[PDB]
Amino acid sequence: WGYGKHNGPEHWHKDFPIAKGERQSPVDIDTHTAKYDPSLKPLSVSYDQATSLRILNNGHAFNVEFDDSQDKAVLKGGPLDGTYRLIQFHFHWGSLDGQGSEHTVDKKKYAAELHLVHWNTKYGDFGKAVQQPDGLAVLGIFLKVGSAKPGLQKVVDVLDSIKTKGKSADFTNFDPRGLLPESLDYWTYPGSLTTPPLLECVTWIVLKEPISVSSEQVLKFRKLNFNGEGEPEELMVDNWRPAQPLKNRQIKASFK
Numbered sequence: 117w118g119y120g121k122h123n124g125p126e127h128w129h130k131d132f133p134i135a136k137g138e139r140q141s142p143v144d145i146d147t148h149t150a151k152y153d154p155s156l157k158p159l160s161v162s163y164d165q166a167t168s169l170r171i172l173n174n175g176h177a178f179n180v181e182f183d184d185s186q187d188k189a190v191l192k193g194g195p196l197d198g199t200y201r202l203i204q205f206h207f208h209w210g211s212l213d214g215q216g217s218e219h220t221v222d223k224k225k226y227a228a229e230l231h232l233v234h235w236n237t238k239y240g241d242f243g244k245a246v247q248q249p250d251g252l253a254v255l256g257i258f259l260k261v262g263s264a265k266p267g268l269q270k271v272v273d274v275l276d277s278i279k280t281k282g283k284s285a286d287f288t289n290f291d292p293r294g295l296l297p298e299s300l301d302y303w304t305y306p307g308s309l310t311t312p313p314l315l316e317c318v319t320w321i322v323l324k325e326p327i328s329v330s331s332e333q334v335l336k337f338r339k340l341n342f343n344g345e346g347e348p349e350e351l352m353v354d355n356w357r358p359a360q361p362l363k364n365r366q367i368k369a370s371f372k
């Protein structure tokens with residue numbers, strides 16, 4: 117599977133039937149139809165004792181992995197019940213600034229979108245979490261083009277080393293707090309993974325406030341390769357899945 121005409125999102129259903137399920141992601145967030153929910157508690161993002169380990173190019177994006185063998189960088193509060201451990205984070209971006217985010221706000225697409233992945237600790241491990249309806253919590257954050265995001269340059273500078281599919285490199289002491297916007301106001305709804313196996317186990321928390329990154333910083337994302345070393349070069353761009361039908365679901369807001 118991939119993002120090409122012949123193996124892109126419109127073909128995924130052939131191997132992963134759930135692609136046409138009842139709670140798939142991403143989706144369009146209709147701000148006026150969203151319901152401000154007063155019962156929603158505050159989001160509690162605790163990244164102070166976080167430990168990054170490696171950065172890897174998996175052929176569809178690059179993942180910064182974290183040591184989740186202890187509660188070090190966790191997510192809780194908001195719509196969640198229980199603690200979720202941060203396992204990794206990746207992005208989805210476009211070939212042009214006007215596209216790239218998976219989720220959209222009133223049909224508006226951003227240049228990229230960050231996914232901080234967390235799994236519910238009551239299920240023992242990531243593999244067990246994906247066998248549960250409330251197994252994962254992904255914190256989504258939109259990227260717009262403007263000023264440079266300082267907390268992003270360490271990531272951007274390492275991309276030279278992970279150009280092709282399969283490469284990785286040590287990436288310790290990275291602080292994910294530098295990728296968070298000032299506000300934690302969010303939209304929340306029950307969805308899925310946006311890439312196969314597309315399992316429906318995610319409680320999506322998409323933040324209202326976007327972060328800014330320079331034009332220079334996004335380009336470097338576009339220099340990565342989908343292919344491995346010694347194969348025709350395919351620039352890793354447009355690695356995003358379009359909005360899916362909302363169906364019998366309502367998006368709730370933490371603000372008004």
Ligand SMILES: NS(=O)(=O)c1ccc(C(=O)NCCCCNCS)cc1
Nearest residue numbers: 231233246254308309310311312313
């Ligand atoms: N895009 S996202 O943040 O929603 C997202 C987050 C995590 C994964 C992930 O871990 N996929 C690997 C599936 C392993 C489970 N074995 C099932 S067959 C995918 C998408």
Ligand SMILES: [Hg+2]
Nearest residue numbers: 248249316317
């Ligand atoms: Hg699930």
Ligand SMILES: [Zn+2]
Nearest residue numbers: 206208231310
């Ligand atoms: Zn993702």
